[PDB]
Amino acid sequence: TITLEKKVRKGIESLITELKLMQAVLSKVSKVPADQLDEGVKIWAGNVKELSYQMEDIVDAFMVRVNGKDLHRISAALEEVVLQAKQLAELRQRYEQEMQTSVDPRMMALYTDVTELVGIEETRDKLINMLTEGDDWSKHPLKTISIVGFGGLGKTTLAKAAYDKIKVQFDCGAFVSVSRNPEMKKVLKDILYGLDKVKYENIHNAARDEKYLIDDIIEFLNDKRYLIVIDDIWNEKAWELIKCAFSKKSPGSRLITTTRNVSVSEACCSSEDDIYRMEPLSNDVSRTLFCKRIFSQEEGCPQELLKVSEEILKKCGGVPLAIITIASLLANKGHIKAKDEWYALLSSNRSLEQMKKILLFSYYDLPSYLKPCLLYLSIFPEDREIRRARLVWRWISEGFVYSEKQDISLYELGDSYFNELVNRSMIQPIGIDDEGKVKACRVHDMVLDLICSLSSEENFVTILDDPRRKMPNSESKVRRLSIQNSKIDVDTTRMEHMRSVTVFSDNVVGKVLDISRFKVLRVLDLEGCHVSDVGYVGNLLHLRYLGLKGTHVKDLPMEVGKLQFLLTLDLRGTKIEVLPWSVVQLRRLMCLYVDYGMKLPSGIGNLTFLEVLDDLGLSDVDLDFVKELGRLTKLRVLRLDFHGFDQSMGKALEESISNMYKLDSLDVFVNRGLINCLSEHWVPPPRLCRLAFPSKRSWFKTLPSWINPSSLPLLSYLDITLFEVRSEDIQLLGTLPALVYLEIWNYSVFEEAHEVEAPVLSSGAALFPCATECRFIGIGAVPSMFPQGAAPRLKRLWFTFPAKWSSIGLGMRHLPSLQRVVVDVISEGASREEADEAEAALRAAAEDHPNRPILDIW
């Protein structure tokens, strides 16, 4: 039986090498647009993909289950898959026989008539003012503007409009377009030929290197005012090289650039005030464009078509490209289509092919390791929004995230992937998480349709709706399933090799299908369903992600200890009370979500690698527990509850916390009273970046001593409720380097009967660098707070003002960037005649400010 072991080891190593080679080939193939592949390579690539799936499964089985029967099965599968690989190779070799270029579809749009653009005037004039901006604009240094957004939004159209409008007030200008994979010689020759068609008429035939072309451009632009537009920049090196030709200084010249990428725009412009962000049209403008495109002369929509029109316009989203293409589709110049045909289109040609080809540029440009992470978005329903933590943990579980470096955490890699997807304008971010990051994301609908078609053409994902998207006609091997309409019934007797199941139905029939037959699973996601108990979760042996959130589960089988591979375990909103003991024996576990009302077993110190722990109970617990807490060393998020926890042992807890070197966020929730932990001389962890005490009824005393800017060099969030605030407490907050967000409560003002005291700031300038929001709830003063001009980035101020102090000046010209102020007045001490006086006074003080912020007196 020894030789069995050795043979199996050898076979597995061979499979690993073969997998590397296959992935290299597939990544190489998947770059070519579909119009340049031939059928042979496409078919062969599909078959290679299937073989890759099978070999991955075999390798994983060996890694998990390692006896006689297992080794025998593994050897059988090994032999079979090797045979199939050889056969496919011969097949390809048998029928191999060796035996122009199209133009960019976006080129025709430059010759569209100008009387067909609907709502440009406003944006056009705003951009023109952003360019000139004054009377002596012809004497200021060179300036660069940039425009960003997603495809089809109308960037080059706006640039063309402004250029044609104001080109008269310059000496020379050009309008050049850079593509995805550019040749720098061609770009420089284009600039030269655009500057003077007569002198450099034959410049496209010259053969010099880039240095001499750059020298020519520099010599021609000497002592001239120029306006130059550069279009469709796709990465950084291109701009880094082209920037050399505009190195000299020339008073009065202007540059414009347009792009889809945000970092490129940050690299072009100097200040973040020189960035224009395109935004979609409003509803009325979109509707007029629609009507003008289809009902062109009548401009009268019949009534029966109103509501389908409105739903279609909502699906378009205000993007002119989609509006135009769908309007041409429904126009059918011969005849307007019928209402039922409109419905059919809504539920579900040259212009359509062009739009698809245009939008796919951003997909064909991604790095190879980001393409699966994008297709994975086709699992979720249409219009809802997606939590990012869910996405990141599922990506890690599926195996899309990996690296070879020794000192890297997969969580931050996944976060980087998400931020990169947002950077390329393919995802709309929404909200702010409770750990300082994005909360959720949204996807445009046409993009969603493109993604669904792409992922369906490769058996990446199979969706189950009843009206559309039924079971594939001829497919025996399905890997990832997504149940959205519970009306259907499922066979699930041929789906031996599943990998991931997800149910989106509130329906009872959703829990009907049997799961214990998918002997190889990695992702089980039943969030929201009404399943009641799962005893079959053991015997799965392959899981990585177990998501049970918002389900009616009362208790877990005491066999989860068998799942030696289990990254995530999500239990929130369930009815569980006490976790089974065997949970201690899950050595690989990186994330544990739980409610504070659940009892944890004793030996929690064994769970190293824990990177996220949510809502510890910390009640009815002895000391060895709080000492074990000090062993989880690589832990980046923590949340406590202090509910029944006895505040006599806080010192051990603070030592255990100070033991965690890597850490970003921290919460402490306390019902009432004085917080008896985190005493002075604590030495917080160095990398801390976010701190919060959301209690609002449990105070600190004067202030923690460890808030000095040396101990907490990094901090971008703070939320504290003190007992009594001093005047030289805000000073210590001025000392903090970053402190983007801040919120302080004065406990004595509300709960006790103390009165609002005016704090005074002194002895310094630039007190609050990078403070965009401040909420001094309980204590307020506008002028004396900010002397000389400090915090030149604030945008929202919250302060309190007694009506007694009607007779201090409310001048808002210390602070340039003000945009919003929320005030509340205390009127019992002073009479109403002083009250309305102070009201009108601060109103005028807000009106004088040039930015003209908004007020609220409350």
Partner 1 sequence: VNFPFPKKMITESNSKDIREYLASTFPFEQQSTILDSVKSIAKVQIDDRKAFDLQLKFRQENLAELKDQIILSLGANNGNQNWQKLLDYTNKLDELSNTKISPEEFIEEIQKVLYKVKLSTSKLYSQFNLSIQDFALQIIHSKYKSNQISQNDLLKLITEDEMLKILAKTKVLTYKMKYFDSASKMGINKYISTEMMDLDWQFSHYKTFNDALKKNKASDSSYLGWLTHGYSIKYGLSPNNERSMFFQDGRKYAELYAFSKSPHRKIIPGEHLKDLLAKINKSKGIFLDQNALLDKRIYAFHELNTLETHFPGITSSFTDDLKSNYRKKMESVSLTCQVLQEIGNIHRFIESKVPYHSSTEYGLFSIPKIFSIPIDYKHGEKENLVSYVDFLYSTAHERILQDNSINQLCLDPLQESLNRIKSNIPVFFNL
Is residue 445 within 8 Å of residue 317, measured between CB atoms?
yes
Other CB atoms within 10 A of residue 381 CB: 12
Q: Using alpha carbons, list the distances in angstroms from residue 318 to 281, 290, 426, 433.
A: 5, 10, 16, 28
What torsion, rounded to 10 degrees, do the Cα atoms 703, 709, 713, 714 define? 50
**Full DSSP string of 231-251:** EEE-SHHHHHHHGGGG-S--T
Q: How far is CA 677 from the centre of its chain?
A: 36
The site for partner 1, by CB under 8 A, has a size of: 25
Chain positions 127 to 186 lying near partner 1, rule: CB under 8 A, are: none
Q: What is the CB-side half-sphere exposure of residue 245 using CA atoms within 13 A?
A: 26
For residue 572 the two structure tokens come to 């929130």
106 is in an annotated binding site: yes
E-strand stretches of 665-811: 665-667, 690-692, 720-722, 743-746, 773-777, 796-802
696 is in an annotated binding site: no
Which of 260, 522 has the CB closer to ligand ATP?
260
321 binds, among partner 1, ligand ATP, none (CB under 5 to 8 A by kind): ligand ATP
Which of 694, 789 has the CB closer to partner 1?
694
Residue numbers preceding breaks in the chain (C to N > 2.5 A): 66, 99, 348, 807
789 touching partner 1, by CB under 8 A: no
602 binds, among partner 1, ligand ATP, none (CB under 5 to 8 A by kind): none
What is the rounded distance in angstroms from the CA atom of residue 854 to the CA atom of residue 820?
A: 5
Which residue in the set 357, 631, 643, 795 belongs to the binding site for partner 1 (CB under 8 A)?
Answer: 643
Which of 109, 855 has the CB closer to ligand ATP?
109
Minimum CB separation from ligand ATP for residue 329, in Å?
15
697 binds, among partner 1, ligand ATP, none (CB under 5 to 8 A by kind): partner 1
Minimum CB separation from ligand ATP for residue 160, in Å?
8
What is the rounded distance in angstroms from the CA atom of residue 239 to the CA atom of residue 250?
A: 19
856 binds, among partner 1, ligand ATP, none (CB under 5 to 8 A by kind): partner 1
What is the rounded distance in angstroms from the CA atom of residue 625 to the CA atom of residue 621?
A: 7
153 binds, among partner 1, ligand ATP, none (CB under 5 to 8 A by kind): ligand ATP
Which of 286, 746 has the CB closer to ligand ATP?
286
671 binds, among ligand ATP, partner 1, none (CB under 5 to 8 A by kind): partner 1
For residue 138 the two structure tokens come to 């012809």
112 binds, among ligand ATP, partner 1, none (CB under 5 to 8 A by kind): ligand ATP
Reduced to 3 states (helix: H, G, I; strand: E, B; else coil), residue 257 is strand
For residue 718 the two structure tokens come to 């703070």
φ and ψ of 28, to 5 deg:
-60, -40
Which of 276, 418 has the CB closer to ligand ATP?
276
Reduced to 3 states (helix: H, G, I; strand: E, B; else coil), residue 101 is coil
643 binds, among partner 1, ligand ATP, none (CB under 5 to 8 A by kind): partner 1
641 touching partner 1, by CB under 8 A: yes
Reduced to 3 states (helix: H, G, I; strand: E, B; else coil), residue 776 is strand
Is residue 47 within 8 Å of residue 25, measured between CB atoms?
no
434 binds, among ligand ATP, partner 1, none (CB under 5 to 8 A by kind): partner 1
Q: Provide the sign of the torsion angle of the four alpha carbons 180, 186, 189, 194, taken in this order.
A: negative
240 touching partner 1, by CB under 8 A: no
Q: Using alpha carbons, list the distances in angstroms from residue 775 to 377, 705, 772.
A: 38, 22, 11
152 binds, among partner 1, ligand ATP, none (CB under 5 to 8 A by kind): ligand ATP
Reduced to 3 states (helix: H, G, I; strand: E, B; else coil), residue 309 is helix
Q: Please enumerate in sequence order all residues whose Cβ is within 8 A of that of 838, keeping only pairs 6 or more positions apart, or say none.
A: 801, 803, 805, 806, 825, 830
Binding span for partner 1 by CB under 8 A among 119-127, 499-507, 606-614, 690-698 = 690-698
826 touching partner 1, by CB under 8 A: no
Minimum CB separation from ligand ATP for residue 293, in Å?
9
Which of 62, 801 has the CB closer to partner 1?
801
434 touching partner 1, by CB under 8 A: yes
Minimum CB separation from ligand ATP for residue 401, in Å?
30
Which of 441, 583 has the CB closer to partner 1?
441
Binding track over 579-598 against partner 1, x by CB under 8 A: -----------------x--
Minimum CB separation from ligand ATP for residue 106, in Å?
5
717 touching partner 1, by CB under 8 A: no
For residue 245 the two structure tokens come to 């030709």
Strands 428-432 and 438-442: antiparallel
Which of 109, 329 has the CB closer to ligand ATP?
109
How wide is the angle at C-alpha 275 spanned by C-alphas 270 and 280, nearest 5°?
170
Strands 720-722 and 743-746: parallel
Which residue in the set 94, 349, 406, 858 belongs to the binding site for partner 1 (CB under 8 A)?
Answer: 858
755 touching partner 1, by CB under 8 A: no
Which of 198, 753 has the CB closer to partner 1?
753
178 is in an annotated binding site: no
751 binds, among partner 1, ligand ATP, none (CB under 5 to 8 A by kind): partner 1
439 touching partner 1, by CB under 8 A: yes
118 is in an annotated binding site: yes
What torsion, rounded to 10 degrees, do the Cα atoms 107, 108, 110, 116 define? -150
Q: Which residues bind ligand ATP (CB under 6 A)?
A: 106, 109, 112, 117-120, 151-157, 232, 260, 289, 320-321, 324, 358
Minimum CB separation from partner 1 for residue 779, in Å?
12
Q: What is the CB-side half-sphere exposure of residue 395 using CA atoms within 13 A?
A: 27
What's the DSSP call for residue 630?
A: G
Which residue in the set 806, 824, 825, 855 belongs to the binding site for partner 1 (CB under 8 A)?
Answer: 824
671 touching partner 1, by CB under 8 A: yes
Which of 275, 440 has the CB closer to partner 1?
440
157 is in an annotated binding site: yes
Number of residues that this document lists for the chain: 858
Helices (H) and strands (E) in the chain, counts: 24, 23
Is residue 791 within 8 Å of residue 817, measured between CB atoms?
no
293 is in an annotated binding site: no
Which segments are annotated as binding site?
Answer: 106, 118, 152-157, 260
- Please report, in range form, the residues annotated as the binding site for ATP: 106, 118, 152-157, 260
Which residues are at the interface with partner 1 (CB under 8 A)?
431-432, 434, 439, 552, 573, 575, 596, 641, 643, 669, 671-672, 694-697, 750-751, 777, 798, 822, 824, 856, 858
